[PDB]
Design a protein around this ligand. Structure first.
Ligand SMILES: O=S(=O)(Nc1cccc(Oc2ccc(F)cc2)c1)N1CCC(NCc2ccccc2O)CC1
Ligand SMILES: CCCCCCCCO[C@H]1O[C@@H](CO)C(O)C(O)C1O
Length: 337
């Protein structure tokens, strides 16, 4: 058992193995607190996340276990995986804090764009990697559902890793079916997000700048058009159908016009991602074969994930059960090569 050392950072107490040195806050929110640290074992900077109050409630307890399970399963170059997980506690009885460790890339997509004007080749590489990671997570039946530039870690070689998936402004990249609260959705909500991100990288501006969700929904419908007979056919709720038609009264926008000077292939791909009907949206695996990624696509190097056991998701357990399951996972953790 490594020796730990305590430290107070921005009001929050951090107790970590001496292995991690020079803690530096990067990170704060409802998801927990995040610090950058120097992993002296490998010589590389890492990201350390201290979960808020992991076992405060059943919902907290379950999401603590969830994130631990998720990270322990992901092993892909475009997806954050678990480098280490630890707790200062020596027993289940004293177990109250959980720390997760992963790669620190250095910047997020917003930062990259802030400093550099992306070339079309940059766009293919960045989106290609997002889609490649997405094919992987989606294959394990996991959905990000909050894909956005701040959830995209990029290193100085513009290589990318998807961050904080399977856990959930955010709205700009959110799929319309979510903003409309239509129930039971699919993996392509992430594809819609990728479309909003890609458009942004091409035009340099937010595609659907809605002050609120309604304003934004009107902007979405204005661009991808009123729902056809086919889509309206799958919406049961009469109130839902009427309301959506009521939001598509803005003058129609032409898709090609919005993305003028961009690569023709880029625009075609954008059209296949920003489809109102999620059943007709291109999937990540399909997207990877699109001609826009000709220079990067390789079917022998775009793997899917090992079977992921998430039967715990349809389980309603007590705090102490969720806590014990989490503790067992912390103990059984074996670091990667
Ligand atoms: O600016 S960051 O503090 N940088 C960062 C960079 C790398 C890893 C990381 O979090 C970790 C750290 C260690 C782990 F093992 C897992 C995640 C955070 N961070 C803050 C949180 C943000 N995601 C919020 C978020 C959380 C849950 C659900 C939807 C969401 O959008 C993503 C970016
Ligand atoms: C109606 C236009 C604004 C909202 C667009 C939502 C488009 C959803 O599209 C799809 O959603 C899935 C559930 O998420 C389905 O199960 C569908 O049948 C479907 O068509």
């Amino acid at each position: 058992r490594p020796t730990f050392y305590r430290q107070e950072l921005n009001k929050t107490i951090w107790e970590v193995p001496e292995r991690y040195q020079n803690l530096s806050p990067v990170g704060s929110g409802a998801y927990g607190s995040v610090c950058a640290a120097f992993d002296t074992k490998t010589g590389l900077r890492v990201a350390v996340k201290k979960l808020s109050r992991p076992f405060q409630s059943i919902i907290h307890a379950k999401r603590t276990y969830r994130e631990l399970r998720l990270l322990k399963h992901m092993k892909h170059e475009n997806v954050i995986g678990l480098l280490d997980v630890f707790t200062p506690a020596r027993s289940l009885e004293e177990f109250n804090d959980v720390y997760l460790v992963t790669h620190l890339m250095g910047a997020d997509l917003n930062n990259i764009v802030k400093c550099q004007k992306l070339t079309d080749d940059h766009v293919q590489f960045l989106i290609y990697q997002i889609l490649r990671g997405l094919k992987y997570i989606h294959s394990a039946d996991i959905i990000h559902r909050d894909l956005k530039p701040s959830n995209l870690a990029v290193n100085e070689d513009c290589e990318l890793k998807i961050l904080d998936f399977g856990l959930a402004a955010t709205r700009w990249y959110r799929a319309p079916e979510i903003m409309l609260n239509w129930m039971h959705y699919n993996q392509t909500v992430d594809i819609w997000s990728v479309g909003c991100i890609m458009a942004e990288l091409l035009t340099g501006r937010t595609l659907f700048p809605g002050t609120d969700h309604i304003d934004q929904l009107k902007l979405i419908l204005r661009l991808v058009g009123t729902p056809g007979a086919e889509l309206l056919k799958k919406i049961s709720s009469e109130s839902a159908r009427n309301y959506i038609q009521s939001l598509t009264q803005m003058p129609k926008m032409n898709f090609a016009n919005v993305f003028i000077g961009a690569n023709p292939l880029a625009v075609d791909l954008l059209e296949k991602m920003l489809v109102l009907d999620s059943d007709k949206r291109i999937t990540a695996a399909q997207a990877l074969a699109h001609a826009y990624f000709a220079q990067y696509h390789d079917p022998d190097d775009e793997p899917v994930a090992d079977p992921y056991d998430q039967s715990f998701e349809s389980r309603d357990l007590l705090i102490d059960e969720w806590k014990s399951l989490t503790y067992d996972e912390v103990i059984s953790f074996v670091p990667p090569p």
